[PDB]
Design a protein around this ligand. Structure first.
Ligand SMILES: CO[C@@H]1[C@H](O)[C@@H](COP(=O)(O)OP(=O)(O)OP(=O)(O)OC[C@H]2O[C@@H]([n+]3cn(C)c4c(=O)[nH]c(N)nc43)[C@H](O)[C@@H]2O)O[C@H]1n1cnc2c(=O)[nH]c(N)nc21
Ligand SMILES: Nc1ncnc2c1ncn2[C@@H]1O[C@H](CSCC[C@H](N)C(=O)O)[C@@H](O)[C@H]1O
Length: 259
């Protein structure tokens, strides 16, 4: 109780260690990352995605759920997986990625993937403190999980209020909604959808251990229904036995500069 998502979260928290690890990957999609990771380790800067995040964003983009263009701001860029992916997209002109980095968090990694010269990544930034800037696309992949969904709600609401500050009339967007099932977050998402449209969409590359959904600009659908469908899916997935992930090839981000 009281929402279905809360029931799922409690059941998730009650799992044994081995049971949790099995559950986390049951019937999900995964990216085949081995060779890309090995190449990056060796100092290779062409082709490779810096994280499995490039493929995660590619899933939204290839389905036109978000269509990055013009000036792209990537809030919480980490190593730069979303930023470098956008750097190669036809209608993108500029990508600014901003992230905490420092001890305990991923630092931006310099790469030479296609359109890298369009991408500027900055570490040591708290995005909640910086003045919003005009942008054509607003991306945000921030949200720290908690065993306590009330804590996640407080965090999620801060992200939602943040991104609201960066959106204009016709902004393309893709925003992680860490916990979309808590009543307070439902209420906020309904208001935001009234104002900016879009809808919440579940990415098949998300793990079963999170109820994250992404608010994407080029989608429609009732907030409550979209969230409850995912609550039911995640509950259904507890019942799977002897199941694991299905892999897909990673993204090839090419090489070279763009003018
Ligand atoms: C010290 O408390 C830990 C952290 O709050 C969190 C792990 O931190 P991390 O920064 O890796 O979190 P994420 O990157 O978002 O991904 P996870 O997929 O590991 O965590 C997402 C949620 O998944 C749950 N969880 C996460 N882990 C690692 C477990 C687990 O081992 N057993 C278990 N029953 N549940 C979990 C918990 O509700 C988490 O909020 O997971 C917690 N954790 C660790 N061991 C346990 C545990 O034995 N039970 C439990 N309910 N939570 C646990
Ligand atoms: N307040 C904040 N300011 C800047 N970055 C933040 C932040 N809160 C969390 N973050 C960062 O946001 C990052 C998410 S990185 C997520 C993956 C990224 N989209 C990729 O494709 O590689 C984490 O590194 C985290 O530390």
């Amino acid at each position: 109780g009281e929402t279905l998502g809360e029931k799922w979260k409690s059941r998730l928290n009650a799992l044994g260690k081995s049971e949790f690890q099995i559950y986390k990957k049951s019937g999900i999609q995964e990216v085949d990352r081995t060779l890309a990771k090995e190449g990056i380790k060796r100092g290779e800067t062409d082709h490779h995605a810096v994280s499995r995040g490039s493929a995660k964003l590619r899933w939204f983009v290839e389905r036109n759920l978000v269509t990055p263009e013009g000036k792209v701001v990537d809030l919480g860029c980490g190593r730069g997986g979303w930023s470098y992916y956008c750097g190669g997209l036809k209608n993108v002109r500029e990508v600014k990625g901003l992230t905490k980095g420092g001890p305990g968090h991923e630092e931006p990694i310099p790469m030479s993937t296609y359109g890298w010269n369009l991408v500027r990544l900055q570490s040591g930034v708290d995005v909640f403190f910086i003045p919003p800037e005009r942008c054509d696309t607003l991306l945000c992949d921030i949200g720290e999980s908690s065993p306590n969904p009330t804590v996640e709600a407080g965090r999620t609401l801060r992200v939602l209020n943040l991104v609201e500050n960066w959106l204009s009339n016709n902004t393309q967007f893709c925003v992680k909604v860490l916990n979309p099932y808590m009543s307070s977050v439902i209420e906020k998402m309904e208001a935001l959808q009234r104002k900016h449209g879009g809808a919440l969409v579940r990415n098949p590359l998300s793990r079963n251990s999170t109820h994250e959904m992404y608010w994407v600009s080029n989608a429609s659908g009732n907030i409550v229904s979209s969230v409850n469908m995912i609550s039911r899916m995640l509950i259904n997935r507890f019942t799977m036995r002897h199941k694991k992930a299905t892999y897909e090839p990673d993204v090839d981000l090419g090489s070279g500069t763009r003018n």
